[PDB]
C-alpha cells in the first residue's frame, strides 16, 4: 500500500454486499456462477486407446454426472461441450504439433550444463553486537524490499474436423452429458507420445467459464451483520451487471489502484485509509484515523496514487532533501 | 543464572544489614523476584530450592 | 502451585474422559460407526489414506484437537480457582495473574492442571511415513497422547513422550522468528523522509 | 547458580569536547579516544517530531 | 502333504539357463556344457552356437556356495517325483553380426 | 516377442523397429539380421488412463471416503479460558501459546474472543 | 542395598582422585566415548587392514601421464617416452623436532609445547612417489617431505595416545584430556561434524530446483550418494523429463554433465533391450503407464544412437565425448576413457569389478523413479534423520588431503610440460632430472592442510560433493568446559541450508529421537540448524564385515539376483550397502528382517555383527518404496536400545527406527506391539540437556535456554592453565559440587570443572531493584568471596 | 579452589574445617551430615560450604613449573 | 574358448519328459545331501531332523497371471547325450516353462517375549 | 567511469564515491552527527528516583 502503491497486489478482492431478498442459498449459487471453472474440475477420468494407415488415438472423457457438476460448479452440458469444441481441441493440437516438432530438433553429451559466520550466532551473541551499536539510520531494507525496489451430430463432427489438424471423429453425450469422445490420427512415422499426459495438461488449462480477472467468489459468515460476498479478483463493471443480487453502490475493494481507475481519487483515498486500518485492526493495534487520513491525503496529493519511494519523492521542491534520501 | 534459564542482571549489591533475614538468622546470597516466574514456568527451580535445602540439612 | 486433594481428584476424573477421545475423533473423520474398534482394518486403511494427504491430515488434526481442547477447558474451569490449596489473595501465583502484575490464567493452568494439546502451525504433531508419531507409539495410534496431547502439568512433571512433543512446540516460535521476520525500518524511513 | 561471563564491551563513555575528524570537524568515533556519541537519522526525526528545533540545533 | 521320491540323479543330466523373458533359440541350436571340480563345489560353463548367434553362460560363484539347484519331474497320478541335479547358469545371447564391430582407437 | 506395442526379437533380445517406419514389406533386426514378416505385428492397442489424483477438484474430493472439509462449527481454534474480552466484555476466550524472539523471555499468549472474534496477544 | 542408583557426593573418591591421577586408565569412559567420532575417524586415515583411508585414496588417484615428444626416427605416431607419476604409499609421523642441524637426533614434541610457543602441533607427512618411465621399463622411487601436517590430539598420531591420566598430568595436559581437536598457531581448532545424505541408497526426490534445469524437466528425481572406500563420494541423479526421457546427471571438476540413462546401461554390460525391459518392468506388463515410458526410453536410444550396437561401441562413444573433460592422456583409447568415466563416476560404491551390480542397481533406480512419478511411492525426506548420516572431521581431512596429493601429481606433470615447451633437455630416466623437477614443485601439502584448519576454507577442484566453501572448522572455544565438550557433540547441515527460507530443516522431527537432542539447539538465527547428538548416540568409524551376509541371506530364501529378473514394489528387493543381493516376497522379507535381528543380538552367528542396520520397509499404500535395506558402513548414527525376545542390547540406526516399535519405559510395553524398550529415556538427551535438574518440570524454552547459559558461564576452563597461552580465559575462583545433581554429572566427571556454586536464594519482592529480571547479590556475601572470578 | 575462609552467608569461619572433615569421612567413617554437625556447622548456610566444596587446588598443584618431574 | 580346468560333460544322464505331468525347480541348501530323502509337502518340512521351510517362489521366477514371463529356460540332453537342447513340450518348440519353483530354506523360531520378567511396575 | 586499473588494486574513490560512500555524506554526517557533550552507559533500574 505505502511503499510500492502496486496496481498489481498479491491478493486483490472485491466485497459485494447482497440484498435482503437474496436468501443464503441463492447467494451460494450466485458464487458458483461467477467463479472460474476449469475443464479438469468436471472430468472424472480420461481413457486413451492408441493403435497402429497411421497412428491413431481414441480419447474418451468421462465426466462426473451431469447433476453433480451442475450442482457443484453451475456448469451446463452445453457450456461443457462448447469448451471442448472450441478452445480445448485447439490447445491439444497446439501441444501435439509442438511435441512433434521436438522429435526433430536433436543432449550433446560431453558439454557441461552452464557473513555466514554471523548467521551462526545465537540471540545472545547477536544482541551483544546490537547493544553497543550507534545506528546511522533506520534498518536497511531486507531481501524482500530489495527484490521489489445423428445429423445435427454428423454435421457438427464434420464442422469440427474441418477446423482442426488431426481429428477424424468427434462425439458428445448430448443427452446425459456424461462423456465426450473423439479420435486423433497422427502421421504414421511419428514416434510415440504420452498422449494421456499431454491431455491431462491441456485439461488443467481449459477454461469452461470465467469472468475476466475473477477467480473464486466465496460466501463468508455475515461479518457485523453485513451480508456480503467476497471475490478473489477485481472487475467492477462485470459486477455492475449483477444489480439483481448485489448493491452496486456498496461494492468495495482491496485494490487501491482499481478503485482509483473506476471511481476516482477521493474513493481511492478512502480505500487507502480503510486498507491500512484493516492491516492494524487484525493485530489489535489501534492507530488514529487522524494519522491515516494524513498519510492518504499525502499519497493522493497529485490526484493519483503516489508511493513513498523514489517517484513520489522526486516531486519535492527541495533538492537537499532528495540528495539526502537516495 | 540458575540452571533453569532464569537469567538475571545484578542490580545492586545489597548491604546485609538491609537484606531480609530468616528465623534461622540467615541472609540470602541472592534474591530472585517472584514476578520472574509466572511467565516462564520454570517449576523445576522451585523443586531445586526444596531439594537443595533438604540436601544441605 | 498445589491443588487440594479434592481438586486433584476433579482433575484426574475429567482427564480420564479423554481416554477414548482420539478414537472417537478418528471414527468421525473416517466416517465410520462411533464405536469402531481402534484396530479395525477399515479404520486403519482410512487413517493411512488420511496420512498421505496434507488436507485430510489437517482435518483429522483439527477435529481431534477440538475435542481434546474441550477436555482441557473443563479441567481448568473446575480446578482453577476452586480446587487450589491456597486461594487468592494468599496464593501469590494466582494473585499475580489476576491483578495484572505478571503472568496469566493460561500460565497458571499449565502449571496446576495440564499443558494441553501441543500445536504446530495449526496442525498437531508430525507423523513419520510409517504412520507413527514416535518410536513408542504403534502405527495409527489414536491415543490423544500420541498426537501431542499433554495431560501432564509443570507441577508434577511431563512424560518423555510429552516432553519431546513439547520441545517441538517450544522451538516453533523461535524457528518462526528466524525465518519469517519482516523488517519495518526501511518503510519508516521512507514515510518520515517524505512527511518530515 | 552460574555466573555468566561478560560478552560485551560494556564500558561507559562521556565526552564534553575532544578530538574531531579532519574533514567534517565533527567528533571522532572512539571511546578509547574520547569519541562522540551519534545522533543519527532516527533521533533527528524524533527531535523534529517533538517540535523542538533548538534541541535539534 | 506327502510326496515320494522315485529317483535322484547325482550326475550331469540337464542344465538351467536364465537369459531373459520369452527367450527362445532357433530349432537347430545346441549347447555344450563344461564342468570343473573346484573344492567340494561344482562349477559349470555353458557355450552354445548357431549360424548367427553365440550363447554363453556361467554359474554364479557366490550363490553356489550356499544354493544347490534341482529339477523335478512330477507324477500327480502318484505321490511321486523324480529329482535331477542341475546347475543354474547366468547366460547371454551374443549376435555374431555385431560382436566384433569396433571404432578406431581414438578419433583424434 | 510380443509385449503389447513393443516387439522383441526372438533370437537376440533387441527391440524390433515399429513396422510402420520401414520402407520394405518385412522388418529386420538390426542386431542379429533376423527377418520378420510385416504381417504379424498389426494394429496392437495400448490403453492408458488418467491417474485418480490427476484432476483435483471439489467433486473429486467428495469421491473420498474420509472427511475432506470442515463445517463452520468445528472451527474453534484452541482451548477456552476465563479472560475478559477487552472489546465486548465476554468472560471466555480461546488461547494459544508461543515462544517469540528468544528463549530468554516469557511465553506469548494469543487470545481469540469466543463470541465477538477480537484477537490479541500478550507478553506479560 | 541392591537398588536403583541414588545420588552421592563421592567426596572421598573425588578428592583422592585429584591427588592421585590414575596410573592405568581414565575414570570417565563416557567422556572419552563422546569424543570418539573425532579420534576414530582420524585414526581411520592410517589404520584399517588396507593401509588406511589415505593409502586407499592415493590408490584411487592412480597415475598422471605425460610424453616427452622425442622422435625415435623411423611411419610413426610415436609420442616419445612416457612418464607416469603416482603416489604409492602415504605416511604420517608423530610430531618430532630435530633442534637444528646435524639432524641432531629427533625428540618428541608434546602439545603443551605447541600451545606455549603459539605454533602448530604437526607431524611430518611423507609421500612415496612412483616415477614410472615407459610403462614400467624403468621406474624411480623417492620418499618426499610434504610438510608438517597438523595432527589430531589424542589420535594414533599424537604422543598423548594411550597415556594414563597420571602420564597426561606429567606431560602438562589435563588429567582427562579428551582431544579431538588440532592445535594451529596456538589456537585449538576442530573440524565440525556435518550432516549429509545417507550412503549408497537411492532416495526418491521431489524438489522444485529439478524443474528449473529446463522446461522439459519435472520435479521428480532419484538421488544416490555413493561413497568410495577412501570416503570421498560421488552423487548420481536421475531426472524424469515430461516427454519420457530419463537423464543421468553427474558432477566432475565442478561442472555438471547429462547422459541419457540408457547409454550408461548399455555401457556397463553386454545387454539386450529385453533385459533392460525385464529389469525395470519385471512382470508388470499390463501397466500401461510403465510400458509406455519404457518404449519411449528404448526407442529413443535407437534412432538417436543407431550405430551403437556393441558394448564396446558405447564405451568408445563416451570416451570420445569425455576424454577432454577427464584429462585423458594421448595414449588412452576412446575405449579406455569410457571405462574410466564409468569407474570414476557411476555408482562408485559398487567398485570397478561390479559392472553387473551397477547395472541391476541402475535398473532398480529407474523403476523407483517411475514409481515416484506415478505416485505409487512417496518421496523420501532428505531433511529427516531417517535419510541422513554424518560426515566426520577425520574423513573430511582425508578427503581434502587426497585432493592435495592429486593437485601435487598434477603440478609435477605441469612442471614437466613447461620443460618440454621451453625446449629444456629432458631425460625421464635420469634421477637428477626427477629431483630437479620436484625441486620446483610446491610440495608443502602440510601447510595447505593448515590453511584449511585455520580458515575453515575448502579449497578444491571438485566440490568434494559438499554445498559450501567455508565454515568447516571452528575454534574449540574453552570459555568453560561445558562449552568445550559441546563443540564435539555438535552437528549441522551446512551454511547452504541456513539461508533457505523454509522451516522444515529447522523442525524437530520424530525421526531424530535418540539421535539428536530435542533440547540443545540455540535460539536466534541458527535455531534448529546447529544441533547436538543425544549423549548415548554413537557414530560408526569403520565398515563392518558384511562379506558373509549374502550367504546367510541366500539360506533364508533370498532368490539370487544373478538369475532372477524382478522389479517394482510387488516384492522385496534385498540390498546390502547399496548392492542388490536378490528378491523375496514381502512376507518372507519381514521374517528375514526379524530373523536377522534375533541372530544378530544373540551373537552366535559369525559374519553378522550387532551394529548391522536392518532397514526393512514394508509394502504400504503410497508410502515409502519398500524393500530390505541392510547397512554396515562408516558414518552411521547408532544407538543402544533393549531387545525383548532375548534380554540383550541391540544397536539401531535412524533408517530402521522409523518402523520400529520401541517402548519408552518397561511399564508401557504392549503385547504384540513392542519389540524393544529403551534403557532409559535419558538416552535421548544430550550431555548438557541431561544435567539440567528436574527439566521435565520446566517449559521447553527454559531447558533450551539453560544449554545456552551453561556454555556462557564463567567456570573452569581447565586446571593445567599455567602451561597455556590462550587468547582469553575466564575463571570462576571457587566452584562447588551441586547438591541437586543429575547422576550423569558424576559420570562425565563434571566436578573436574566446577561451573557454579550453591547459593542461598530467596524468592522475594523486597528491595524494589529486582523487577524486570534484575537480581540482587548480598554485599557481604560478595565481600566474602561469593562468585569471584578472574 | 581452596576451602573458603568464611561461609558466604553466616560469616562463620569455615576454612579451619576442611582437613578435619575429610578425616571424619575417611577415618571415623561417618556420613556427611553427621560429620558436618560434629564440626559445629549448624545453619544450612554453613553446612553447604563444606559439604559441597571441591578442592580443585589439589589438581592445580600437580603442575609445578619449579621442579624436575 | 574353454577356461582352465573344465572338461566337456561327455555322457549326459537321462531325462524322462512328456491331468498331465509337471516340471519343477527346487532350491535346497548346498549342505543338504539330496540323494537321501523321502518326503516333500504341497509350509514346513524337516530334512535330517533339522527343520526347513518350503516357499512357493513361482511368482518371482515367472508370472502367475500371464504366460511367457519366465526367467528360466530348461536345457535337456540332445539325441547324442553329448550336448543340450532347449526343452520343449508344445510340439511348436515353444520352450518349457517351469510349472512351479520351490525354495527350501532355513527357518528360526524367535522366542516369545516374557512379559513377566520384562513388564515391571 | 574510469577504466579499471592494473586489474587488481581496487579503484580509488572519486568525488562521487566520497559523497556516496555507504549511507553517504548527507545521511552519515549531515542528517546525523557525532556530538559533543553526551554520554553512554548500561542502564539499571531504580524505584527511588
Ligand atoms: Zn535379433
Ligand atoms: Zn469479545
Ligand atoms: Zn554456612
Amino acid at each position: 500500500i505505502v511503499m510500492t502503491a502496486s496496481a498489481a497486489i498479491k491478493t486483490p478482492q472485491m466485497t459485494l454486499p447482497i440484498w435482503n431478498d437474496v436468501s443464503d442459498e441463492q447467494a451460494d449459487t450466485f458464487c458458483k456462477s461467477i467463479s472460474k471453472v476449469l475443464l479438469s474440475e468436471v472430468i472424472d477420468k480420461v481413457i486413451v486407446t492408441e493403435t497402429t494407415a497411421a497412428r491413431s488415438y481414441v480419447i474418451h472423457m468421462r465426466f462426473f454426472d451431469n447433476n453433480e457438476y451442475s450442482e457443484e460448479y453451475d456448469v451446463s452440458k452445453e457450456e461443457l461441450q462448447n469448451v471442448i469444441s472450441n478452445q480445448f481441441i485447439h490447445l491439444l493440437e497446439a501441444a501435439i504439433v509442438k511435441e512433434i516438432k521436438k522429435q526433430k530438433r536433436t543432449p550433446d553429451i560431453g558439454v557441461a550444463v552452464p557473513n555466514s559466520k554471523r548467521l551462526e550466532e545465537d540471540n545472545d551473541e547477536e544482541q551483544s553486537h546490537k547493544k553497543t551499536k550507534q545506528a546511522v539510520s533506520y534498518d536497511e531494507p531486507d531481501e524482500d524490499e530489495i527484490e521489489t525496489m445423428n445429423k445435427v451430430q454428423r454435421d457438427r463432427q464434420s464442422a469440427i474436423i474441418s477446423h482442426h489438424r488431426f481429428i477424424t471423429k468427434y462425439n458428445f453425450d448430448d443427452e446425459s452429458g456424461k462423456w465426450c469422445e473423439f479420435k486423433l490420427e497422427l502421421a504414421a512415422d511419428t514416434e510415440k507420445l504420452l498422449m494421456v499426459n499431454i491431455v491431462e495438461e491441456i485439461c488443467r488449462k481449459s477454461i469452461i467459464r470465467q469472468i475476466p480477472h475473477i477467480d473464486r467468489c466465496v460466501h463468508p459468515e455475515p461479518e457485523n451483520g453485513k451480508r456480503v460476498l467476497v471475490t478473489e479478483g477485481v472487475n467492477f463493471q462485470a459486477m455492475w451487471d449483477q444489480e439483481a443480487f448485489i448493491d452496486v453502490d456498496g461494492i468495495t475493494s482491496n485494490d487501491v489502484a482499481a478503485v482509483l481507475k473506476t471511481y476516482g481519487v477521493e474513493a481511492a483515498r478512502n480505500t487507502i485509509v480503510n486498507e491500512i486500518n484493516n492491516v492494524f485492526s487484525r493485530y489489535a493495534i489501534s492507530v488514529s484515523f487522524r494519522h491515516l487520513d494524513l498519510i492518504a491525503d499525502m499519497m493522493t496529493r497529485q490526484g493519483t496514487y503516489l508511493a513513498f519511494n523514489r517517484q513520489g519523492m522526486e516531486t519535492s521542491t527541495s533538492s537537499f532533501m532528495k540528495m539526502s534520501y537516495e | 543464572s540458575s540452571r533453569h534459564g532464569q537469567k538475571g542482571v545484578c542490580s545492586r549489591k545489597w548491604p546485609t544489614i538491609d537484606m531480609p533475614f530468616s528465623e534461622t538468622g540467615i541472609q540470602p546470597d541472592i534474591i530472585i523476584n517472584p514476578h520472574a516466574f509466572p511467565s516462564r514456568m520454570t517449576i523445576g527451580m522451585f523443586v531445586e530450592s526444596l531439594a537443595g535445602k533438604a540436601g544441605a540439612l | 502451585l498445589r491443588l487440594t486433594a479434592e481438586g486433584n481428584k476433579w482433575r484426574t476424573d475429567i482427564l480420564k474422559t479423554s481416554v477414548d477421545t482420539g478414537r472417537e475423533a478418528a471414527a468421525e473423520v473416517t466416517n465410520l460407526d462411533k464405536d469402531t474398534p481402534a484396530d479395525d482394518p477399515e479404520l486403519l486403511k482410512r487413517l493411512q489414506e488420511i496420512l498421505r494427504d496434507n488436507n485430510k491430515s489437517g482435518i483429522l488434526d483439527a477435529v481431534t484437537s477440538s475435542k481434546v481442547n474441550a477436555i482441557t477447558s473443563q479441567v481448568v474451569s473446575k480446578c482453577v480457582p476452586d480446587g487450589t490449596m491456597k486461594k487468592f489473595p494468599c496464593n501469590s501465583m494466582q494473585a499475580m495473574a489476576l491483578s495484572g502484575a505478571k503472568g496469566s490464567n493460561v500460565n497458571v493452568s499449565q502449571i496446576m492442571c495440564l499443558l494441553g494439546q501441543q500445536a504446530l502451525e495449526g496442525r498437531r504433531v508430525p507423523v513419520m511415513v510409517s504412520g507413527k508419531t514416535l518410536p513408542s507409539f504403534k502405527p495409527y495410534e489414536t491415543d490423544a497422547m500420541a498426537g501431542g496431547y499433554v495431560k501432564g502439568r509443570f507441577y508434577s512433571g511431563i512424560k518423555p513422550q510429552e516432553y519431546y512433543f513439547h520441545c517441538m512446540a517450544g522451538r516453533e516460535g523461535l524457528i518462526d522468528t528466524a525465518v519469517k521476520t519482516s523488517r519495518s525500518g526501511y518503510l519508516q524511513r521512507c514515510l518520515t523522509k517524505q512527511l518530515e | 547458580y552460574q555466573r555468566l561471563r561478560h560478552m560485551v564491551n560494556d564500558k561507559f563513555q562521556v565526552r564534553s569536547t575532544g578530538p574531531v575528524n579532519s574533514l567534517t570537524m565533527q567528533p571522532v568515533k572512539g571511546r578509547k579516544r574520547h569519541g562522540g556519541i551519534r545522533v543519527g537519522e532516527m533521533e533527528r526525526d524524533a527531535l523534529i517530531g517533538h517540535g523542538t528545533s533548538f534541541l535539534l540545533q | 502333504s506327502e510326496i515320494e521320491i522315485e529317483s535322484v540323479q547325482d550326475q550331469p543330466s540337464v542344465a538351467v539357463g536364465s537369459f531373459f523373458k520369452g527367450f527362445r533359440a532357433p530349432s537347430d541350436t545346441t549347447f555344450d556344457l563344461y564342468k570343473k571340480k573346484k573344492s567340494e563345489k561344482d562349477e559349470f560353463v555353458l557355450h552354445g552356437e548357431n549360424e548367427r548367434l553365440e550363447y554363453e553362460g556361467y554359474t554364479d560363484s557366490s550363490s553356489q556356495a550356499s544354493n544347490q539347484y534341482v529339477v523335478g519331474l512330477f507324477n500327480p497320478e502318484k505321490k511321486s517325483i523324480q529329482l535331477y541335479k542341475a546347475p543354474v547358469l547366468v547366460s547371454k545371447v551374443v549376435s555374431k553380426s555385431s560382436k566384433n564391430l569396433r571404432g578406431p582407437k581414438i578419433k583424434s | 516377442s510380443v509385449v503389447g506395442s513393443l516387439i522383441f526379437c526372438l533370437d537376440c533380445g533387441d527391440l524390433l523397429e515399429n513396422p510402420n517406419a520401414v520402407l520394405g514389406s518385412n522388418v529386420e533386426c538390426s542386431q542379429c539380421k533376423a527377418i520378420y514378416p510385416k504381417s504379424q505385428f498389426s494394429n496392437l492397442k495400448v490403453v492408458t488412463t488418467t491417474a485418480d489424483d490427476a484432476f483435483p477438484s471439489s467433486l473429486r474430493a467428495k469421491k473420498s471416503v474420509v472427511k475432506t472439509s470442515l463445517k463452520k462449527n468445528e472451527l474453534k481454534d484452541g482451548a477456552t479460558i476465563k479472560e475478559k474480552c477487552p472489546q465486548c466484555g465476554n468472560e471466555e476466550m480461546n488461547y494459544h501459546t508461543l515462544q517469540l524472539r528468544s528463549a530468554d523471555e516469557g511465553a506469548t499468549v494469543f487470545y481469540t474472543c469466543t463470541s465477538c472474534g477480537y484477537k490479541f496477544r500478550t507478553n506479560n | 542395598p541392591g537398588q536403583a542408583r541414588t545420588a552421592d557426593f563421592r567426596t572421598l573418591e573425588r578428592e583422592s582422585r585429584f591427588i592421585n591421577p590414575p596410573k592405568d586408565k581414565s575414570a570417565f569412559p563416557l567422556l572419552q566415548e563422546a569424543v570418539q567420532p573425532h579420534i576414530g575417524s582420524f585414526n581411520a586415515l592410517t589404520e584399517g587392514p588396507d593401509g588406511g583411508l589415505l593409502n586407499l585414496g592415493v590408490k584411487d588417484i592412480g597415475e598422471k601421464v605425460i610424453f616427452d615428444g622425442k622422435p625415435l626416427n623411423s611411419n610413426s605416431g610415436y609420442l616419445g617416452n612416457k612418464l607416469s607419476v603416482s603416489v604409492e604409499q602415504v605416511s604420517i609421523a608423530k610430531p618430532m623436532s630435530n633442534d637444528g642441524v646435524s639432524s641432531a637426533v629427533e625428540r618428541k614434541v608434546y602439545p603443551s609445547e605447541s600451545r606455549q610457543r603459539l605454533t602448530s602441533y604437526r607431524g611430518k607427512l611423507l609421500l612415496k612417489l612412483k616415477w614410472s618411465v615407459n610403462n614400467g621399463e624403468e621406474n624411480l622411487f623417492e620418499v618426499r617431505d610434504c610438510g608438517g601436517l597438523p595432527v589430531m590430539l589424542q589420535s594414533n598420531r599424537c604422543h598423548l595416545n594411550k597415556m594414563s591420566p597420571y602420564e597426561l598430568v606429567q606431560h602438562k595436559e589435563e588429567s582427562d584430556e579428551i582431544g579431538g581437536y588440532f592445535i594451529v598457531n596456538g589456537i585449538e581448532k576442530l573440524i565440525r561434524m556435518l550432516i549429509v545424505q545417507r550412503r549408497n541408497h537411492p532416495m526418491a526426490i521431489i524438489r522444485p530446483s529439478f524443474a528449473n534445469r529446463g522446461a522439459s524437466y519435472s520435479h521428480y528425481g532419484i538421488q544416490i550418494r555413493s561413497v568410495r572406500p577412501d570416503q570421498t563420494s560421488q552423487t548420481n541423479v536421475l531426472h524424469y523429463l515430461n516427454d519420457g526421457q530419463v537423464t543421468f546427471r553427474f558432477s566432475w571438476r565442478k561442472n555438471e554433465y547429462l547422459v541419457p540413462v540408457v547409454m550408461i546401461l548399455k555401457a556397463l554390460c553386454h545387454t539386450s533391450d529385453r533385459e533392460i525391459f525385464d529389469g525395470i518392468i519385471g512382470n508388470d506388463v499390463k501397466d500401461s503407464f510403465l510400458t509406455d515410458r519404457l518404449e519411449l526410453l528404448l526407442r529413443g536410444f535407437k534412432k538417436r544412437y543407431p550405430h551403437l550396437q556393441n558394448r564396446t561401441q558405447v564405451l568408445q562413444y563416451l570416451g570420445d565425448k569425455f576424454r577432454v573433460v577427464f584429462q585423458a592422456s594421448p595414449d588412452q583409447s576412446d575405449l579406455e576413457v569410457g571405462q574410466e568415466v564409468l569407474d570414476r563416476i557411476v555408482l562408485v560404491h559398487l567398485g570397478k569389478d561390479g559392472s553387473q551390480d551397477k547395472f541391476r542397481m541402475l535398473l532398480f533406480m529407474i523403476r523407483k523413479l517411475y514409481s515416484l512419478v506415478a505416485g505409487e511411492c512417496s518421496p523420501d525426506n532428505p531433511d529427516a534423520t531417517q535419510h541422513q548420516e554424518v560426515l566426520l572431521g577425520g574423513f573430511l581431512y582425508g578427503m581434502i588431503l587426497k585432493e592435495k596429493i592429486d593437485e601435487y601429481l598434477q603440478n609435477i606433470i605441469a612442471q614437466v610440460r613447461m620443460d618440454i615447451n621451453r625446449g629444456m633437455a629432458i631425460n625421464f630416466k635420469d634421477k637428477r632430472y626427477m629431483s630437479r623437477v620436484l625441486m620446483r614443485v610446491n610440495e608443502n601439502i602440510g601447510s595447505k592442510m593448515q590453511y584449511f584448519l585455520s580458515t575453515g576454507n575448502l579449497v578444491s577442484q571438485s566440490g568434494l560433493d559438499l554445498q559450501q566453501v567455508s565454515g568447516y572448522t571452528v575454534v574449540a572455544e574453552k570459555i568453560n568446559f561445558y562449552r568445550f565438550i559441546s563443540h564435539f557433540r555438535m552437528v549441522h547441515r551446512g551454511s547452504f541450508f541456513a539461508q533457505l527460507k523454509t522451516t522444515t530443516v529447522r523442525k524437530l522431527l520424530p525421526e531424530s529421537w535418540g539421535f539428536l537432542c530435542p533440547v540443545h539447539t540455540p535460539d536466534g538465527s541458527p535455531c534448529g540448524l546447529l544441533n547436538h547428538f543425544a549423549h548415548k548416540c554413537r557414530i560408526s568409524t569403520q565398515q563392518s564385515d558384511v562379506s558373509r551376509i549374502p550367504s546367510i541371506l541366500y539360506s533364508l530364501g533370498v532368490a539370487p539376483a544373478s538369475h532372477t529378473f524382478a522389479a517394482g514394489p510387488s516384492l522385496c528387493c534385498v540390498q546390502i550397502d547399496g548392492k542388490i543381493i536378490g528378491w523375496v516376497s514381502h512376507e518372507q522379507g519381514k521374517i528375514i528382517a526379524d530373523t536377522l535381528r534375533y541372530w544378530k543380538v544373540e551373537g552366535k552367528t559369525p559374519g553378522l555383527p550387532i551394529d548391522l542396520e536392518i532397514g526393512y520397509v514394508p509394502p504400504s499404500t503410497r508410502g515409502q518404496y519398500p524393500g530390505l535395506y541392510l547397512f554396515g558402513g562408516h558414518s552411521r548414527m547408532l544407538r543402544p536400545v533393549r531387545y525383548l525376545p532375548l534380554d540383550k542390547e541391540d544397536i539401531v540406526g535412524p533408517f530402521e527406527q522409523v518402523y520400529m516399535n520401541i517402548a519408552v519405559t518397561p511399564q508401557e510395553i504392549q503385547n504384540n506391539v513392542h519389540t524393544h524398550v529403551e534403557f532409559t529415556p535419558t538416552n535421548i538427551l544430550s550431555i548438557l540437556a541431561n544435567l539440567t535438574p528436574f527439566s521435565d518440570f520446566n517449559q521447553s524454552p527454559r531447558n533450551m535456554y539453560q544449554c545456552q547459559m551453561g556454555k556462557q558461564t564463567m567456570g573452569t576452563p581447565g586446571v593445567a592453565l599455567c602451561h597455556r597461552s590462550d587468547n582469553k580465559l575466564y575463571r570462576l575462583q571457587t566452584g562447588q559440587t551441586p547438591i541437586v545433581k543429575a547422576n550423569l554429572y558424576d559420570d562425565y566427571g563434571m566436578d573436574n570443572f566446577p561451573n557454579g556454586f550453591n547459593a542461598v536464594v530467596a524468592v522475594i519482592s523486597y528491595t524494589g531493584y529486582d523487577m524486570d529480571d534484575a537480581m540482587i547479590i548480598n554485599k557481604s556475601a560478595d565481600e566474602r568471596g561469593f562468585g569471584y572470578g578472574t | 579452589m581452596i576451602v573458603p575462609v568464611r561461609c558466604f552467608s553466616c560469616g562463620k569461619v569455615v576454612g579451619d574445617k576442611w582437613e578435619s572433615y575429610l578425616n571424619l569421612l575417611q577415618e571415623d567413617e561417618l556420613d556427611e551430615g553427621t560429620a558436618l554437625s560434629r564440626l559445629g556447622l549448624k545453619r544450612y548456610c554453613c553446612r553447604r560450604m563444606i559439604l559441597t566444596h571441591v578442592d580443585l587446588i589439589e589438581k592445580f598443584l600437580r603442575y609445578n613449573p619449579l621442579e624436575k618431574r | 574358448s574353454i577356461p582352465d580346468g573344465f572338461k566337456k560333460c561327455k555322457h549326459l544322464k537321462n531325462f524322462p519328459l512328456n491331468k498331465q505331468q509337471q516340471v519343477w525347480l527346487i532350491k535346497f541348501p548346498s549342505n543338504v545331501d539330496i540323494s537321501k530323502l523321502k518326503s516333500l509337502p504341497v509350509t514346513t518340512m524337516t530334512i535330517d531332523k533339522h527343520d526347513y521351510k518350503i516357499m512357493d517362489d513361482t511368482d518371482i521366477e515367472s508370472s502367475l497371471t500371464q504366460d511367457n514371463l519366465s526367467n528360466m529356460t530348461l536345457l535337456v540332453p540332445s539325441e547324442s547325450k553329448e550336448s543340450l537342447k532347449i526343452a520343449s513340450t508344445a510340439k511348436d518348440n515353444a520352450p518349457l516353462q517351469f510349472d512351479k519353483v520351490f525354495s527350501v530354506s532355513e527357518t528360526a523360531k524367535i522366542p516369545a517375549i516374557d512379559y513377566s520378567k520384562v513388564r515391571v511396575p | 567511469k574510469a577504466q579499471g586499473r592494473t586489474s587488481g588494486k581496487v579503484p580509488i574513490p572519486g568525488v562521487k564515491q566520497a559523497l556516496e560512500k555507504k549511507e553517504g555524506l548527507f545521511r552519515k554526517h549531515m542528517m546525523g552527527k557525532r556530538v559533543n557533550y553526551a554520554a553512554r552507559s548500561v542502564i539499571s533500574p531504580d524505584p527511588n528516583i
Side-chain angles (χ1 to χ4, degrees), chain C residues 48 130 132 135-136 164 166 172, chain G residues 507 621 658 660 662 674 700:
Chain C
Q48 187 184 160
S130 63
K132 323 174 54 190
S136 67
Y164 197 94
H166 177 63
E172 266 286 314
Chain G
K507 281 163 130 46
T621 309
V658 172
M660 283 208 208
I662 307 177
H674 300 98
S700 40

Side-chain angles (χ1 to χ4, degrees), chain D residues 22-48:
Chain D
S22 206
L23 289 182
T24 67
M25 291 290 100
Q26 301 176 359
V28 103
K29 170 196 184 143
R31 188 191 89 66
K32 226 135 190 158
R33 56 168 183 173
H34 301 290
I37 268 69
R38 166 173 286 119
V39 174
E41 292 203 277
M42 300 180 283
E43 16 282 332
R44 194 208 80 154
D45 299 333
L47 296 177
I48 297 165

Side-chain angles (χ1 to χ4, degrees), chain C residues 48 52 121 128-130 132-133 135-136 154-158 161 163-164 166 168 170-172 175 179, chain G residues 506-509 511 513 518 621-623 657-662 664 668 674 695-700:
Chain C
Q48 187 184 160
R52 305 308 181 205
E121 287 174 21
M128 300 182 292
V129 69
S130 63
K132 323 174 54 190
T133 60
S136 67
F154 287 125
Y155 170 77
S156 29
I158 63 181
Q161 301 106 304
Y163 188 114
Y164 197 94
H166 177 63
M168 297 179 175
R171 188 190 289 206
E172 266 286 314
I175 301 181
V179 170
Chain G
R506 308 173 106 117
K507 281 163 130 46
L508 166 67
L509 302 186
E511 29 278 88
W513 173 280
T621 309
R622 301 194 209 249
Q657 191 172 279
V658 172
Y659 299 88
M660 283 208 208
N661 297 323
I662 307 177
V664 182
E668 292 180 336
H674 300 98
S695 55
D696 45 336
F697 297 78
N698 298 324
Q699 188 189 47
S700 40

Side-chain angles (χ1 to χ4, degrees), chain G residues 652-673:
Chain G
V652 162
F655 186 93
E656 49 186 355
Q657 191 172 279
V658 172
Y659 299 88
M660 283 208 208
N661 297 323
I662 307 177
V664 182
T665 61
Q667 301 79 57
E668 292 180 336
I669 295 183
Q670 296 168 37
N671 292 78
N672 303 116
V673 173

Side-chain angles (χ1 to χ4, degrees), chain G residues 41-42 51 85 206 370 422 447 480 506 586 676 734 746 765:
Chain G
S41 68
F42 187 90
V85 209
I206 291 181
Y370 282 143
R422 197 161 74 245
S447 99
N480 70 49
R506 308 173 106 117
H586 296 299
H676 300 68
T734 297
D746 291 327
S765 283

